[PDB]
Design a protein around this ligand. Sequence first.
Ligand SMILES: COc1c(OCc2ccc(F)cc2)cc2oc3cc4c(c(OC/C=C/C(=O)O)c3c(=O)c2c1CC=C(C)C)C=CC(C)(C)O4
Ligand SMILES: [Mg+2]
Ligand SMILES: [Zn+2]
Length: 320
Amino acid sequence: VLAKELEDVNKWGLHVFRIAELSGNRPLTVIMHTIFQERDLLKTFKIPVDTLITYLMTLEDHYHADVAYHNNIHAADVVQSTHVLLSTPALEAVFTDLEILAAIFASAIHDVDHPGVSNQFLINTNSELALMYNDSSVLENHHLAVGFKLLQEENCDIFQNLTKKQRQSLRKMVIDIVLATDMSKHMNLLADLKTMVETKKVTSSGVLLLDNYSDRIQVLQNMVHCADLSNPTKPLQLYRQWTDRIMEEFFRQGDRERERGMEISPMCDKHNASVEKSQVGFIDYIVHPLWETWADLVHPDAQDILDTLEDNREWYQSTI
Ligand SMILES: COc1c(OCc2ccc(F)cc2)cc2oc3cc4c(c(OC/C=C/C(=O)O)c3c(=O)c2c1CC=C(C)C)C=CC(C)(C)O4
Ligand SMILES: [Mg+2]
Ligand SMILES: [Zn+2]
């Protein structure tokens, strides 16, 4: 049954919540294991199967089960979504196995040990995290720090058989990718992606042409960023449960902010919320400009995804 559901791993709108239930709250381990097998990454990179499972289970453990959105289910969802975006025809044979590995690894660790509050909340409450990271991409630096540190636990180094050059290069790409998931960088990341689409070059086979590191990492950065912002592009029954979860986490932060005499962050005030209006807002100003730009990059590969996003936007609008 779980094996049956894991057959949809190459499809957008995989039912990740059912996989979480059917796997005993291990969506991240089973989805990553499935993907690594499907891409033959264990053979390519000589990853012992027991090492892979041991690391995935430790990594999954360090997502908070009592955080409603930023948990191991979100992590599995972003992994799988990145996996599908990597298979788009316009990117066929563009990225190396190592780059593919970096973007999937980055997706899996990208929110680990997220405590359920935003960077700004952690800065304004003079948290230990904000003090360690000097108010700059506080959460994103921590996700990386944890995701790499766990590689050193007993039988957890899934990269043990990479060359030195391979390890160095993967590490840098993973850092570059996860630091780009910081929402405060969205505008500059989208602005760069627009520029790339406007000067887009394709090869004789129709595939996207990426000459240099800068272009290659920027596509992988925006790819994982799109995967991170992909809830509104999924089938509505999935999207709605992500909205429920984000609003619970947001409202909880807002209660803490109220208790402390702070101003409540946008969308965190449960006595003054408009869930539907905000999803429409967020899609119109953030999610759709990004996905429309990605759709242009990989035209027409992403047309169904963009269509689903436009329907979901219409549906949320219709309930106001
Ligand atoms: C403060 O800005 C805002 C903001 O401002 C208020 C506003 C902005 C524009 C607008 F039009 C309406 C409201 C509203 C926001 O609304 C969201 C809605 C969401 C989700 C969000 O998370 C994205 C994933 C995060 C992760 O995986 O970590 C976000 C945001 O992150 C967000 C941010 C960004 C955060 C910053 C700058 C710190 C996730 C799932 C769905 C789509 C179901 O719902
Ligand atoms: Mg994050
Ligand atoms: Zn995330």
